[PDB]
Amino acid sequence: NYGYQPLFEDRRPRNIGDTLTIVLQENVSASKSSSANASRDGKTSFGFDTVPRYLQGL
Amino acid sequence: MTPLKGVDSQVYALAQGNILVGGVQVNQLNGGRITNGAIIERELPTQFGAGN
Numbered sequence A: 001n002y003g004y005q006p007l008f009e010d011r012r013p014r015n016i017g018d019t020l021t022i023v024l025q026e027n028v029s030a031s032k033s034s035s036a037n038a039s040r041d042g043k044t045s046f047g048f049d050t051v052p053r054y055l056q057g058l
Numbered sequence B: 001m002t003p004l005k006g007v008d009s010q011v012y013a014l015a016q017g018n019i020l021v022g023g024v025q026v027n028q029l030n031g032g033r034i035t036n037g038a039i040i041e042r043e044l045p046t047q048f049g050a051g052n
């Protein structure tokens, strides 16, 4: 090979045949949450158990 | 016997010999010169003599 080569550079790959080292160190994490609620409660009462003579009509 | 190479990483000379260094302005004692200390090994092709 007659190609020029720098002395002080970091010897990065530059041509087709050059080799490079890859450190994967891949780490991905995704999360998703959702919630919903709805509560309705009702309860009504009414009773005499004793009615006046004048109110017995109703 | 240090090999002297060009920018192409090719050995173009071989250097070996004795260093000569100078013996308030003190001389540089970490740098010396060797006269005729390197012998060439390769010859660079040239176009000289070709063309007009």
Ligand SMILES: CCCCCCCCCCCCCCCC(=O)O[C@H](CCCCCCCCCCC)CC(=O)N[C@H]1[C@@H](OP(=O)(O)O)O[C@H](CO[C@@H]2O[C@H](CO)[C@@H](OP(=O)(O)O)[C@H](OC(=O)C[C@@H](CCCCCCCCCCC)OC(=O)CCCCCCCCCCCCC)[C@H]2NC(=O)C[C@@H](CCCCCCCCCCC)OC(=O)CCCCCCCCCCC)[C@@H](O)[C@@H]1OC(=O)C[C@H](O)CCCCCCCCCCC
Binding pocket: A054, A055, A056, A057, A058
């Ligand atoms: C937002 C506001 C808007 C305004 C709203 C207006 C009022 C909106 C309306 C509210 C009133 C509900 C109407 C109920 C009667 C009705 O029409 O709808 C019924 C179906 C229900 C639909 C309602 C959906 C509304 C939908 C919701 C709408 C809401 C908006 C059909 C029906 O008719 N079903 C019917 C049938 O059943 P069956 O199907 O099986 O056959 O027959 C059986 C057997 O009949 C009984 O027999 C008895 C003997 O056996 C006999 O006694 P006896 O003496 O003879 O012995 C006895 O006679 C008697 O009461 C004798 C005598 C009693 C006098 C005692 C003193 C009481 C004073 C009491 C004074 C009241 C004080 C407020 O009378 C009356 O003078 C009644 C008083 C009149 C007051 C007038 C108000 C002046 C304003 C005074 C104002 C005061 C100012 C401070 C006989 N009673 C009857 O006939 C029935 C009827 C005879 C009508 C002739 C009298 C003149 C009416 C003249 C005109 C009336 C017109 C309305 O009386 C009533 O209640 C009428 C009540 C009216 C109140 C309105 C208030 C207006 C405010 C005005 C506001 C603007 C009944 O049981 C059954 O009726 C029952 O069960 C009813 C039960 O009792 C009573 C439960 C009440 C609980 C509250 C409701 C709770 C319900 C809630 C859930 C929905």
